[PDB]
Amino acid sequence: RYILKQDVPSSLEDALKVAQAFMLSDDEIYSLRIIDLIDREQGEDCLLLLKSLPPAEAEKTAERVIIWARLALQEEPDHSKEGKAWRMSVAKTSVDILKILCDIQKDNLQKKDECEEMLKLFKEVASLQENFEVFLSFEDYSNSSLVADLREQHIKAHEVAQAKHKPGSTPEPIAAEVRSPSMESKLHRQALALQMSKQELEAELTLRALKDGNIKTALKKCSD
């Protein structure tokens, strides 16, 4: 740890032989190097180091750093800008190393399903963090109540994003020959993590409009 704190270009090599001659695994060396680079938000260096490493020790370093990342994300969220930036960087650096580990473990069937499930969980966490700036713990993440609440919130948001666009008054001199991005595309950006297709969105909108007493908008969508 002291050698790795010197920021010497050969400090990684200096610390390698310390654990080599004293009969300690190289797993800890590269794991701590990757952790130090993650704390410095330098995940590209982690990627190049992982690609330079042989796959055998690469698996060991990757699984340990993934466990460390989930454990570090399990504590209380930080409401400062630097804290949330660190959570986002950790998730983004974890997703692609999980992809690499999935590529490595194609034949290890016992490890294959575990890695695919863990990759899916971190993909959902990172997608929810980046597209929403919502940071909690994994116990709060896996709880389906928050997922359903955020699904219905953005269903209602899509309701208004079109309801305001049916003209209740004269149009404004906005989006004149330079049209703004569609609200449906942003909702779909959000829902790619929510795994909601167009058919389910239309089904929910039909029921929501029916509850509002609007008959024509539900019938037209059913006919389409």
Binding site: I35, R64, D113
Partner: protein, 341 residues
Amino acid sequence: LPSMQSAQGLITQVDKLSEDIDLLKSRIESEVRRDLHVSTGEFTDLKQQLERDSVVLSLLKQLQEFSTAIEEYNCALTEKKYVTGAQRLEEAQKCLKLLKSRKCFDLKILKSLSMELTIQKQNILYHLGEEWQKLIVWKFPPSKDTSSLESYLQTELHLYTEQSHKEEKTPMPPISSVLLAFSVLGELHSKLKSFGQMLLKYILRPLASCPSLHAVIESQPNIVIIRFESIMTNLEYPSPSEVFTKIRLVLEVLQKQLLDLPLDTDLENEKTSTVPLAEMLGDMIWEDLSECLIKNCLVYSIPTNSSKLQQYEEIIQSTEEFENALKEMRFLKGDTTDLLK
């Protein structure tokens, strides 16, 4: 480098300083009750500072305990005493939560404490994950296929029963200790999720799809082998009674060979209770097993002629015992499930 003996020096000096704080507080309290009208204010004014120093000293005690628990856990790692190391880590976590609950230290110091705690926690968890895979072995065919008969034929499950005292120079702790270590740190929930799903995918679901599959359990003293051996049958869909018997045959061994070990929570905390292993294992597989049995076995057992209705009675009976056994083996919580309704 030059502070290993200074750690014991710190222990001694903090102990004698706590003793000094206590004796001076006793001296102050002895004289406060004597002069309660003339000496109260100036005694209390200095007792406030004494109590603040005592609070800071208690925080330093918590830091010393944080260091000592980590060092004892490091010592326990080398000797493969994972349960005590996990308990020491839990004590350190409890100390760190109280350290972070009071805003009195530098933020970077607490950041370093938390970083080292997480490093040691991932260190013990990775060792537990390593040691999990030696005891339980899944031997797969060289493909992801689960539709061909050879896919089920080349599937093997191995449980390394430690019947005799291990003489290997690379020893393996007993499965009960592994389960205790996972329960102390609260990570048994994810491991059960990982294992029950592969059990469902490669053991449970196959038995409800192909009527020709038969589960053979070879019981060696050290290695228990679960194997699929193909015996040809003439039924287009598996009948309920044989499928229930085959499921019960595997579930008895799985409960007795693996799930028959007591659990224990943190040593210093008795506010947490131990949940039986069979309950948690069933809760994560029973929902997907009842629907698999209904949609693959009980649907096709329904007769097409009214004359064959009475012969269905055994299926009503044979299900109930399959419902009862899992209730005796604690794989279920209630009495009426969707498999019987």
